[PDB]
């Protein structure tokens, strides 16, 4: 058995077949942030 690691998660959504997606693209994102420095975390709440 072998191991590995996904390069990054900072290129947002994509809809191409997995053979051609660039490095960092993901399949689904919703109510998240693509923030650098802090990572791929949740968005804050909306204030009234």
């Amino acid at each position: 058995a072998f191991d590995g690691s996904i390069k990054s998660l900072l290129q947002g959504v994509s809809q191409q077949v997995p053979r051609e997606r660039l490095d960092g693209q993901v399949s689904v994102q919703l109510n998240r942030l693509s923030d650098v420095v802090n990572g791929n975390r949740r968005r804050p709440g909306a204030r009234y």
Binding site: A1, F2, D3, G4, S5, I6, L9, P18, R19, R21, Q25, V26, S27, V28, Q29, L30, N31, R32, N38, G39, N40, R41, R42, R43, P44, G45, A46, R47, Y48
Partner: protein, 194 residues
């Protein structure tokens, strides 16, 4: 707090009046959410027991002291990675139909319990809650938030690599920050390449 269109309100004798701008949403399936607003326990979830249909008065769960609190609505934070790939020296892709995925490794900077679902072309494989906070961590105390400054989680898959879909949900007061992802891949070539 982790809620939408939240307002501040005072609670006395485990009762208060629902603000006007949330009556319509809660009446159409939206989920009411309450949180602490001050002191060391700030940000922690609290629940309710009933809502009077005529006066819109709300009664909270037992043993909440008088003070300031927030009130709002919930939302989800779905995410879904892309399946791994095998790539040789020159960058070509190989083994799309001859590889099997065994596991995921997740490193989290801060998080609580979340929900994970893994499914295949025709059946479900994994399901249930996961967390990175253990019973022997000093981070777990009463009257403190339930979050871990650093941890890891492991999830089994046992299925073909590319015929899979993975999702992670979280709709509670705790964050979900993903720093890195790792996997274990079982692939075995049986002839040289040229």
């Amino acid at each position: 707090p982790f809620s939408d269109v939240y307002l501040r309100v005072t609670i006395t004798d485990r009762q208060f009046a629902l603000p006007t701008r949330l009556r319509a949403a809660v009446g159409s399936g939206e989920g009411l959410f309450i949180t602490f607003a001050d002191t060391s326990m700030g940000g922690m979830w609290v629940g309710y027991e009933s809502i009077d249909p005529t006066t819109y008065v709300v009664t909270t769960v037992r043993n909440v002291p008088d003070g300031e609190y927030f009130v709002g609505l919930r939302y989800t934070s779905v995410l879904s990675p892309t399946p791994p790939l095998v790539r040789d020296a020159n960058g070509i892709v190989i083994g799309t139909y001859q590889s099997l995925l065994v596991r995921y490794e997740l490193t989290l900077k801060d998080s609580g319990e979340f929900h994970a679902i893994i499914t295949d072309s025709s059946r479900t494989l994994t399901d249930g809650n996961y967390s990175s906070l253990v019973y022997s961590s000093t981070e777990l105390l009463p009257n403190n938030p339930t979050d871990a400054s650093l941890g890891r989680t492991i999830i089994p898959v046992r299925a073909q690599a590319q015929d899979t879909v993975a999702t992670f949900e979280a709709n509670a007061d705790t964050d979900l920050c993903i720093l890195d992802i790792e996997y274990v891949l079982q692939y075995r070539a049986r002839r040289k390449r040229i």
